[PDB]
Amino acid sequence: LCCEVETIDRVLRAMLKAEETCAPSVSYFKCVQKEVLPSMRKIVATWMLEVCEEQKCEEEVFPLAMNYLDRFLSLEPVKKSRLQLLGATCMFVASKMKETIPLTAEKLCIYTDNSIRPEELLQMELLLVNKLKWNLAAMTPHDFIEHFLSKMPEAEENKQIIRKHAQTFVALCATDVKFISNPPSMVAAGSVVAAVQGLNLRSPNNFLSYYRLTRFLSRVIKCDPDCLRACQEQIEALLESSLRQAQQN
């Protein structure tokens, strides 16, 4: 968001405002959905992440597409048979928003083994955009990560390692119901925290921003520092079950 000066934090405050306008409902599985359950969301979400990984999508595509998914699911009941169709349409719109070369309707259907069809996708897209009222320019955890990182006296080699670990934590959250309860800022902060801490632990004179990072980002975020704490620990828990997704086979 490119000012003409340098007299013109004012940016971050804006990011925080935007994200508030794109929050899903925490109680949508109860109050809105009759068939769709969290474990199905998990399934579609892990599908969506493998597609982004396989296609080497811009990092933001997966979290943005989940924001879409949780948002729609907050407004419309969906049949569990249509969930995959919804997830693919969310990726389709998220890709259009964030990629120089977006995913094609056809390529996405290929990832469904052609269980869904382009015209189905094209029809869902209009439903989805209209329902979100075309407010598609949502914040992602990645937006905040990079912002936080620009405030941190970390060498670029440090930052890149932090970035890599933190993006992993985000993708983990996005598959989980937590992505529904916590705004992108919170999610980005917990992941940054979990990242910088784990890193510092293995390199004590390095990644020094770990010290009181929770309160710090809490202040930057304007959240509750114990909410961030819970968040981070939920992230660390979620990663410690990544050795079950590794040996679920």
Binding site: P102, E125, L126, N130
Partner: protein, 267 residues
């Protein structure tokens, strides 16, 4: 929100704009439509991205820009999708404000105030990478209470397709000299329009008027004087006309900005 008409406020550059009522908010709204091509990849990406970028502005809650509050792709054909844009309604523009303003000014502190909201609004827009491109006293809306709200910004690219089928009605008295391409089509273009609005507030008729591009582009040099290469009767305070020229600096790269302008002696 299904919206229902209540007037036909105008039929300018972007088709017919209807005034409608929000049936649960009770508030009025200004509706406009736009035809878009229904491609093989569904919604045209530039429309999605540009419309989305306007939707997000509303978050900033800036007082000098009209909020885009809703969007709906209503119709749909193998070649076209019809999208209605739902804007905050503002019942009068800068014209009506300047027309019902008795002899002679008036006054300066009020003109300074207008100009100061106008540049604030524009500075906001420009910062968020949105160029108006078609700034007009009609695009400049005025609340009761004197808040200027900029409207119709960021619709140039959204309306590209429709407008190329095929008008073209070019009310040209405010267009920056650049717009008559080459070449861009950048942010400064709005500041030229600012100055042309600037002057006309003390005047009472569009300096640089009708006729074609050449006639339009010619009437500009009359007052600014031709620009040697390679550049290819005030009624306000003396300080006022200082800023005005800076705005009317035929060259974009050293034409005053909305922030540099805001920080002018005259203000």
């Amino acid at each position: 929100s299904r919206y229902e008409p209540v007037a036909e406020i105008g039929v300018g550059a972007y088709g017919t704009v209807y005034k409608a009522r929000d049936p649960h908010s009770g508030h009025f709204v200004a509706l406009k439509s736009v035809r878009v091509p229904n491609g093989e990849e569904g919604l045209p990406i530039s429309t999605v991205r540009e419309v989305a970028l306007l939707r997000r502005l509303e978050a900033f809650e800036h007082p000098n820009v009209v909020r885009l509050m809703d969007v709906c792709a209503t119709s749909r054909t193998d070649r076209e999708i019809k999208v209605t844009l739902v804007f905050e309604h503002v019942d009068q523009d800068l014209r009506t404000y300047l027309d019902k303003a008795p002899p002679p000014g008036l006054p300066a502190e009020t003109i300074k105030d207008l100009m100061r909201q106008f540049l604030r609004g524009l500075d906001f827009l420009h910062a968020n990478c949105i160029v108006h491109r078609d700034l007009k006293p009609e695009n400049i809306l005025v609340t009761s209470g004197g808040t200027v709200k900029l409207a119709d910004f960021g619709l140039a690219r959204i309306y590209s397709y429709q407008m190329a089928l095929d008008p073209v009605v070019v009310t040209l008295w405010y267009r920056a000299p650049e717009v008559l391409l080459q070449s861009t089509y950048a942010t400064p273009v709005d500041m030229w329009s600012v100055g042309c609005i600037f002057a006309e507030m003390f005047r009472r008729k569009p300096l640089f008027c009708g006729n074609s591009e050449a006639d339009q582009l010619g009437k500009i040099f009359d007052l600014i004087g031709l620009p040697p290469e390679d550049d290819w009767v005030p009624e306000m305070e003396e300080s006022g006309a200082q800023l005005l020229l800076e705005m009317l600096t035929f060259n974009p790269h050293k034409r005053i900005s909305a922030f540099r302008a805001l920080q002018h002696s005259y203000l």
